[PDB]
Amino acid sequence: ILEAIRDHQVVIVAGETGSGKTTQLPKICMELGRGIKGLIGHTQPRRLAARTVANRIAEELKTEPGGCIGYKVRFSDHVSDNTMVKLMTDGILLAEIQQDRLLMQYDTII
RNA sequence: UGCCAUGUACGUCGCACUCAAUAGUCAGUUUUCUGUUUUUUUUUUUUUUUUUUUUUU
């Protein structure tokens, strides 16, 4: 997967219910080096799912949520300046497209 | 206020009520339903009814 994301501009991953690709892919972007110049936007279809995966990877990296890896859903602006992974619902990204058309805040969109 | 010449012709009769009775002509297969009273009123205005599912500076 790391070779795929360092060799392709578009990567696609397929996984079952017990895979963990959702958990590991932001850490794969970390091991490449993404997150530094621009945030890593991970889109989730559900608020509880986005909250759970953000807190899960924060606990896995032994950081409190709202630090390195934080989630933005409706009025949970739970992101500090030292973030690099940003959870968001497709609607929240739909809100940010008009705020910045170029998606310049991010470098990786999951 | 005196007189008035003579003889001169008769008979009998009829009418009514009525009139009756007559020629010939044999037969018609068996079986059937149809049939009767009685309580009477038939008829009365109604109602609210269920739910995949998921995201938005």
Coordinates of C-alpha atoms (C1' of nucleotides) in Angstrom, one line a residue:
Chain A
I1 CA 0.0 0.0 0.0
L2 CA 2.9 2.4 0.8
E3 CA 4.5 1.7 -2.6
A4 CA 1.1 2.2 -4.2
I5 CA 0.6 5.6 -2.6
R6 CA 4.1 6.7 -3.4
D7 CA 3.8 5.5 -7.0
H8 CA 0.2 6.5 -7.9
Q9 CA -1.9 9.7 -7.5
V10 CA -5.0 7.6 -7.1
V11 CA -5.0 4.5 -4.9
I12 CA -7.9 2.2 -4.2
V13 CA -8.1 -0.3 -1.3
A14 CA -10.8 -2.9 -0.8
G15 CA -11.3 -4.6 2.6
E16 CA -13.8 -6.8 4.5
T17 CA -15.4 -6.2 7.9
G18 CA -12.3 -7.3 9.9
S19 CA -9.6 -5.8 7.7
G20 CA -8.4 -2.6 9.5
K21 CA -7.5 -0.6 6.3
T22 CA -9.4 2.3 7.8
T23 CA -7.2 2.2 10.8
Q24 CA -3.9 1.7 9.1
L25 CA -4.1 3.9 6.0
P26 CA -3.5 7.3 7.8
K27 CA -0.5 5.6 9.5
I28 CA 0.7 4.5 6.0
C29 CA 0.5 8.2 4.9
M30 CA 2.4 9.0 8.1
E31 CA 5.1 6.5 7.2
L32 CA 5.4 8.0 3.7
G33 CA 5.6 11.5 5.3
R34 CA 2.2 13.0 4.5
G35 CA 0.5 15.2 7.0
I36 CA 3.3 17.7 7.2
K37 CA 2.8 20.1 4.2
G38 CA -1.0 19.5 4.2
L39 CA -3.5 17.6 6.2
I40 CA -4.7 14.1 5.6
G41 CA -8.4 14.2 5.0
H42 CA -10.2 10.9 5.9
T43 CA -13.9 11.0 4.8
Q44 CA -16.4 8.9 6.8
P45 CA -20.1 8.5 6.0
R46 CA -21.2 8.7 9.7
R47 CA -20.4 10.9 12.7
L48 CA -20.0 8.1 15.2
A49 CA -17.7 6.2 12.7
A50 CA -15.5 9.2 12.1
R51 CA -15.3 10.0 15.9
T52 CA -14.5 6.3 16.7
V53 CA -11.7 6.0 14.1
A54 CA -10.2 9.3 15.0
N55 CA -10.1 8.5 18.7
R56 CA -9.0 4.9 17.9
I57 CA -5.9 6.0 16.0
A58 CA -5.2 8.7 18.6
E59 CA -5.2 5.9 21.2
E60 CA -3.1 3.7 19.0
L61 CA -0.5 6.3 18.5
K62 CA -0.8 7.2 22.3
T63 CA -1.9 10.8 21.7
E64 CA -5.0 12.4 23.1
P65 CA -7.6 13.2 20.5
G66 CA -7.7 16.7 19.2
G67 CA -3.9 16.7 18.8
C68 CA -2.2 14.9 15.9
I69 CA -5.3 13.2 14.6
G70 CA -8.7 15.0 15.1
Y71 CA -12.2 14.9 13.7
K72 CA -14.4 17.8 12.4
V73 CA -18.1 17.1 12.4
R74 CA -20.8 19.6 13.1
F75 CA -19.4 22.0 15.7
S76 CA -16.7 19.6 16.9
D77 CA -13.8 21.8 15.7
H78 CA -11.7 19.3 17.6
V79 CA -8.4 20.1 15.9
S80 CA -5.3 21.9 17.2
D81 CA -2.5 23.5 15.2
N82 CA -0.3 20.5 15.6
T83 CA -2.7 18.2 13.8
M84 CA -1.9 16.3 10.7
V85 CA -4.8 13.9 10.2
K86 CA -8.3 15.4 9.8
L87 CA -11.4 13.3 9.9
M88 CA -14.5 14.7 8.1
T89 CA -17.9 13.7 6.7
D90 CA -18.3 14.0 2.9
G91 CA -20.7 16.8 3.8
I92 CA -18.0 18.6 5.8
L93 CA -15.7 18.4 2.7
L94 CA -18.7 19.6 0.7
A95 CA -18.7 22.6 2.9
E96 CA -15.0 23.2 2.6
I97 CA -15.0 23.0 -1.2
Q98 CA -16.5 26.5 -1.4
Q99 CA -14.2 27.7 1.3
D100 CA -11.2 26.5 -0.7
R101 CA -11.7 25.2 -4.2
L102 CA -8.2 23.9 -4.8
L103 CA -8.3 21.6 -1.6
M104 CA -5.1 23.3 -0.7
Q105 CA -5.4 22.5 3.0
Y106 CA -4.9 18.8 2.3
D107 CA -2.3 16.7 0.6
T108 CA -4.0 13.3 1.0
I109 CA -7.8 12.7 0.7
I110 CA -9.1 9.4 1.9
Chain B
rU1 C1' -231.5 39.2 -41.7
rG2 C1' -236.7 35.2 -45.7
rC3 C1' -234.0 31.1 -49.0
rC4 C1' -229.7 28.0 -50.3
rA5 C1' -232.1 22.3 -56.5
rU6 C1' -230.5 16.5 -57.2
rG7 C1' -226.8 12.3 -56.5
rU8 C1' -221.7 12.1 -55.4
rA9 C1' -214.5 8.9 -52.9
rC10 C1' -210.5 5.1 -48.0
rG11 C1' -206.1 0.3 -47.2
rU12 C1' -201.7 -5.8 -43.1
rC13 C1' -195.1 -7.7 -41.1
rG14 C1' -189.8 -10.9 -41.9
rC15 C1' -182.5 -12.4 -41.7
rA16 C1' -177.6 -15.1 -39.6
rC17 C1' -171.7 -17.0 -37.9
rU18 C1' -167.2 -19.4 -39.5
rC19 C1' -161.3 -23.3 -39.3
rA20 C1' -157.4 -29.0 -34.4
rA21 C1' -152.4 -32.2 -33.7
rU22 C1' -147.6 -35.6 -39.6
rA23 C1' -139.1 -38.6 -40.3
rG24 C1' -134.5 -39.4 -40.6
rU25 C1' -129.2 -38.7 -37.5
rC26 C1' -124.4 -45.1 -35.1
rA27 C1' -119.8 -44.2 -32.3
rG28 C1' -116.0 -41.1 -29.8
rU29 C1' -108.7 -45.4 -26.7
rU30 C1' -106.0 -44.9 -21.3
rU31 C1' -104.2 -41.6 -17.6
rU32 C1' -102.9 -36.6 -15.2
rC33 C1' -101.5 -32.5 -12.1
rU34 C1' -104.0 -28.0 -10.8
rG35 C1' -105.9 -25.6 -4.3
rU36 C1' -104.6 -22.4 -0.1
rU37 C1' -103.6 -18.5 5.3
rU38 C1' -100.4 -17.4 8.3
rU39 C1' -96.7 -13.7 11.6
rU40 C1' -98.2 -8.8 8.9
rU41 C1' -93.4 -3.3 11.5
rU42 C1' -90.7 -4.1 5.0
rU43 C1' -86.7 0.2 8.9
rU44 C1' -84.4 3.5 11.7
rU45 C1' -77.0 8.3 10.9
rU46 C1' -71.8 8.0 11.1
rU47 C1' -66.3 9.0 11.3
rU48 C1' -60.4 9.8 11.8
rU49 C1' -55.1 4.2 12.5
rU50 C1' -48.8 4.0 11.3
rU51 C1' -42.9 4.4 11.1
rU52 C1' -36.0 2.0 4.8
rU53 C1' -32.6 5.1 5.7
rU54 C1' -28.4 8.2 6.0
rU55 C1' -24.3 13.0 5.6
rU56 C1' -24.0 19.1 5.5
rU57 C1' -18.1 25.5 7.0

